[PDB]
Amino acid sequence: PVVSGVASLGYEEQEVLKMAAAVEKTATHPIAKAIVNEAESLNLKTPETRGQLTEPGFGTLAEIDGRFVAVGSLEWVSDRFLKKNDSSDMVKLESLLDHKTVVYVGREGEGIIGAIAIS
């Protein structure tokens, strides 16, 4: 179980991974470990977090530098924040992923900002 790809919209790939690994820091599940290991393997410094919410089978949320960030399934990440992504952004993101699990990444005030493909 390893990261196979990082999809983003306006963000740098590294920024999406850094945020996702910050949220996934202490999750024990092999997928979360892989996101963390990839940020580690690439020598990425993850931002600090105090506090997190984990919803088993859905995802994990934590505040990163003053904004909440959620990592998990598409619907649960999308539902976490009032800001929703344009329909064209969803097509673009899904078109890239369509070309193995996908973990989505979202941020309050922005909606979905990226996704991590796992193999």
Author numbering: 558 to 656, 669 to 688
The authors write:
P-type ATPases are transmembrane proteins that play a key role in the uphill transport of a wide range of cations across membranes using the energy provided by the hydrolysis of ATP, being crucial for the ion homeostasis in nearly all organisms and for heavy metal detoxification. HMA1 and HMA6 are found in the inner membrane of the chloroplast envelope and HMA8 in the thylakoid membrane. Here, we present two structures of the nucleotide binding domain of HMA6 and HMA8, the former at the highest resolution, obtained for any P-type ATPase structure. The overall structure of HMA6N-AA and HMA8N (respectively) exhibits a twisted, antiparallel β-sheet made of six strands being flanked by two pairs of short α-helices, one on the concave (α1 and α2) and one on the convex (α3 and α4) side of the sheet.
HMA8 supplies plastocyanin in the thylakoid lumen with copper, which also controls the stability of HMA8, but not of HMA6. However, they exhibit differing catalytic properties, HMA8 having a higher affinity for Cu and lower dephosphorylation kinetics than HMA6. The N-domain of HMA8 (HMA8N) was readily expressed and purified, representing monomeric protein, which eluted as a symmetric peak with a calculated mass of 17.2 kDa. For both proteins, two molecules are present in the AU, yet they are monomeric in solution as found by size exclusion chromatography. The position of the second missing loop is identical in both structures, differing only in the length, as in HMA8 an insertion is present, not typically found in the subfamily. Furthermore, the insertion found in HMA8 could interact tighter with the P-domain and report on the N-domain inclination. In parallel, several attempts to obtain the structure of the HMA N-domains in complex with ATP were made by soaking or co-crystallization on HMA8N. They led to diffracting crystals but no density of the nucleotide could be observed. Of interest is also a second salt bridge in the vicinity of the nucleotide binding domain, E673-R697 in HMA6 and E612-R637 in HMA8, linking β2 to α3. Marked differences between ATP/ADP ratios in the cytosol and the chloroplast stroma, as well as between the pH of these two subcellular compartments (increase of the stromal alkalization on illumination), might also explain differences in electrostatic properties of this surface (HMA8 requires the efficient use of ATP at a low ATP/ADP ratio found in the stroma).
